[PDB]
């Protein structure tokens, strides 16, 4: 997250870290046994880390649970990043409380202008690299589809939306991928892609979760 603020320990209780020996992507806990992330975060041997703030210090509220199954969307295209969403089943149910909780799925799509919260452990610099150890947060609005398509001609599908600031300065970045965009208490987006981080006229692009609710619910019910 570039240009954000320190969330505070366990203030984003649905945020997960995907670990393969090291943090490599974010994710969101959507019930006791299932996590949603970005398909471009796929890899084998994932451990899901819940209750994290400092990802390099054991602070006492963590739950570390291995993945038993990963399901990439049937229509994920890695060249265009269309349908950039994946479901991960935990080997055992997590223990839910105030500091570790699920985020609700949307019933409706969110409209442009709605303010959302984006969070992650990704790079904090637009030029160069500095990775935080504690969770960072950013408040940002959903941009109109017209402005999003104007920023990225030819690249934006119905399954994507832009959020952020056309002036630059504030954005998600590498290492935030997979993580949540939450608006009015619902999961509306997944951190997916963009052209660099925090640049002028290049906002972040996010997977539009409202289009996938039926696939998520049917997949969870049969796996
Ligand atoms: N600035 C959007 C973004 C770029 C690369 C990875 C994740 C997010
Ligand atoms: Ca920790």
Domain ranges of the chain: 1-12+103-210, 13-102+211-222
Candidate of 181, 191, 198, 201 to mutate for ligand 1, largest count of ligand atoms within 8 Å of Cβ: 191
Helix (H, G, I), strand (E, B) or coil at 112: coil
Topology at the third CATH level for domain 13-102+211-222: Thrombin, subunit H (2.40.10)
Segments of the chain assigned E as strands: 5-6, 15-19, 23-31, 34-37, 47-50, 63-72, 86-90, 115-120, 136-141, 160-163, 180-183, 186-193, 204-208
Of 142, 137, 98, nearest to 120 by C-alpha is: 137
Is 73 one of the annotated active-site residues of the chain? no
CA separation (Å) from 124 to 4, 16, 133, 161? 8, 18, 11, 22
> Among this protein's residues, is 40 annotated catalytic?
yes
Experimental method: neutron
Active-site option among 23, 28, 84, 119: 84
């Amino acid at each position: 997250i570039v240009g954000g603020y320190t969330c505070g320990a366990n203030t984003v209780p649905y945020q997960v870290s995907l670990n393969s020996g090291y943090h490599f992507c974010g994710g969101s806990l959507i019930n006791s046994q299932w996590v949603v992330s970005a398909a471009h975060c796929y890899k084998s041997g994932i451990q899901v880390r819940l209750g994290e703030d400092n990802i390099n210090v054991v602070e006492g509220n963590e739950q570390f649970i291995s993945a038993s199954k990963s399901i990439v969307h049937p229509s994920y295209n890695s060249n265009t990043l269309n349908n950039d969403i994946m479901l991960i089943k935990l080997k055992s149910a997590a223990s839910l409380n105030s500091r570790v909780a699920s985020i609700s799925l949307p019933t409706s799509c969110a409209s442009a202008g709605t303010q959302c919260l984006i969070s992650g452990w990704g790079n904090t610099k637009s030029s160069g690299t500095s990775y935080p150890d504690v969770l960072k947060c950013l408040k940002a609005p959903i941009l109109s589809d017209s402005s999003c398509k104007s920023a990225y001609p030819g690249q934006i599908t119905s399954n994507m939306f832009c959020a952020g600031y056309l002036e630059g300065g504030k954005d998600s970045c590498q290492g935030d991928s997979g993580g949540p965009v939450v608006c009015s208490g619902k999961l509306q987006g997944i951190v997916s892609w963009g052209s660099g981080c925090a640049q002028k006229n290049k906002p972040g692009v996010y997977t539009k979760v409202c289009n996938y609710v039926s696939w998520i619910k049917q997949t969870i019910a049969s796996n």
